Amino acid sequence: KIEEGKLVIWINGDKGYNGLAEVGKKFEKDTGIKVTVEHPDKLEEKFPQVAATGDGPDIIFWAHDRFGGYAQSGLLAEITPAAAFQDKLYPFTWDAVRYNGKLIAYPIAVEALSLIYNKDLLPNPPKTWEEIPALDKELKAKGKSALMFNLQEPYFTWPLIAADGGYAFKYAAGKYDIKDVGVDNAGAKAGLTFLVDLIKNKHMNADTDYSIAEAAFNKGETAMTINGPWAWSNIDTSAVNYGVTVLPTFKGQPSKPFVGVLSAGINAASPNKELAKEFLENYLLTDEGLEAVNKDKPLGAVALKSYEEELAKDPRIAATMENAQKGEIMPNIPQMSAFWYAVRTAVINAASGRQTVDAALAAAQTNAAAKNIEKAKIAKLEADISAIKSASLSYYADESKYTDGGMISWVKKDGKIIINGGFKDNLGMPYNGSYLLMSSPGHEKYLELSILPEGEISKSGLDKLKNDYGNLIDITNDQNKINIVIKLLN
């Protein structure tokens, strides 16, 4: 497994490993424990594999959104920072490294999209999205465009869509509700419509991707663009007088970009959790520690309050932090994968005019939430089946039969359950259909529960019921009233 008495650290190759190695030198100097900083490739997928076998690095640096999945697999240890140390970091950064109720990583850096503008073409960037059309008409008269940014990835268009109410997953009490997606709400409809209106009025092109927008801004063809700190170096080699500021507002509300928090997690299988904690809290997450890493590679905005005030001297870094505070922490749950494809398809379909804004977002809401909504409905259906079996078994232990009276029927009328003018002996009934229990007086091995669910169940849903009860289910009548029968006894 992992050798005791040392620290193995994984970080991406674009992060400051030479400066991080210097922090390890000062740590070895003061403690005698050697620290090796390696930056191998494909570590975001190498870690969950290798750590499942109880191996890997002691500390892993990566964006916070993948750590929630790691925590679900039990690959990350719970960190124990004192309240005194937590106050050294911005409070909202601690929310990016939370799964369930526990802290599972140290926040390091903070990144978000910002508005990048050409100071020669536009010395005063606009504060609102609504004034960009008139700015484009004024700039097109001189052969320039107002704004070009990547429309192919929902990461870049989401700040406008979410500004008026859109959200990925509802965050309630440290937990994300994977059944609640805010893609088809009124706010997302307003944001996407304004984006589509910009395209239909020839202010932007629906085929604009990352490379086309970056090339146009670097050659001084467009006055503005939307990008993150990773693109600054390509603008510096272009030498165009550019600035970085807060994203424009939409309907009086700020744009809400997804916030990415570079985080350091401790391997649950590491025998050096105290060493990792000591290194991260009192060596890396200091003014000297972050400066050494930043001298090797700029971190952008950082979660440490004391050092962020120093980095904020760069107005580009100050703008990145400002847009991040006004944005939404990117959910760290693996259900975001279905969110990305759903929104990506909706934006592309609406931008090219293949669907209406309502039809694109209605499909995306389905593409992002329907499978998780059905998973809950199926589990509640199985909860009723186990409850009916439990109550039927409790009748045997005290009486001498199952149903007693021949048949029992549950049918859901208008909000309540009824047993039809005759009581026998709380079931949510997620599909509002009908339950019916079959048993003839005699024997001890003949219980048959038949269900007539209302609504509809996908093929992936019915197959979930075939993977749980084996051959104990015979699904008939796939048209009109579907029928599910289960033998509650083995």
Author numbering: 1 to 370, 1026 to 1080, 1089 to 1153
Quote the original article.
Additionally, we have resolved the X-ray crystal structure of PilW, which we use to model possible structural mechanisms for the formation of C. difficile biofilm through interactions between type IV pili and the DNA of the extracellular matrix. The majority of the two structures is superimposable, including the four strands of the PilA1 β-sheet and the C-terminal α-helix (which is also found in a superimposition of PilA1 and PilJ); the most obvious point of divergence is the αβ loop, which has a short helical section in PilA1, but adds two strands to the β-sheet of PilW. This loop appears to be highly flexible; in the four molecules of the PilW asymmetric unit, it can be traced in two distinct conformations (chains B and C), with insufficient density to resolve it in the other two. The conformer found in chain C of our crystal structure can be accommodated in our pilus model with only minor adjustments to the backbone, while the conformer in molecule B would require a total rearrangement, leading us to conclude that the chain C conformation is close to the native conformation found in the assembled fibers. While the C-terminal domain of PilJ extends out from the pilus fiber, PilW is nearly identical to PilA1 in size (the mature proteins, without the pre-pilin leader sequence, are 185 and 179 amino acids, respectively); but due to its extended αβ loop, PilW is wider along the helical axis of pilin incorporation than PilA1 or PilJ. Like other type IV pilin proteins from Gram-positive bacteria, PilW lacks the C-terminal disulfide bond found in the vast majority of their counterparts from Gram-negative bacteria. Unlike PilA1, PilW does not have a two-strand anti-parallel β-sheet in its place, despite the overall similarity of the two structures in this region. Equivalent residues in similar positions can be observed in the PilW structure, at Lysine 30 and Aspartate 85. Our comparison of the two structures reveals a region of striking similarity on what would be the interior face (buried in the assembled pilus), which may help to explain both the antibody cross-reactivity and the incorporation of multiple subunits into T4P fibers.
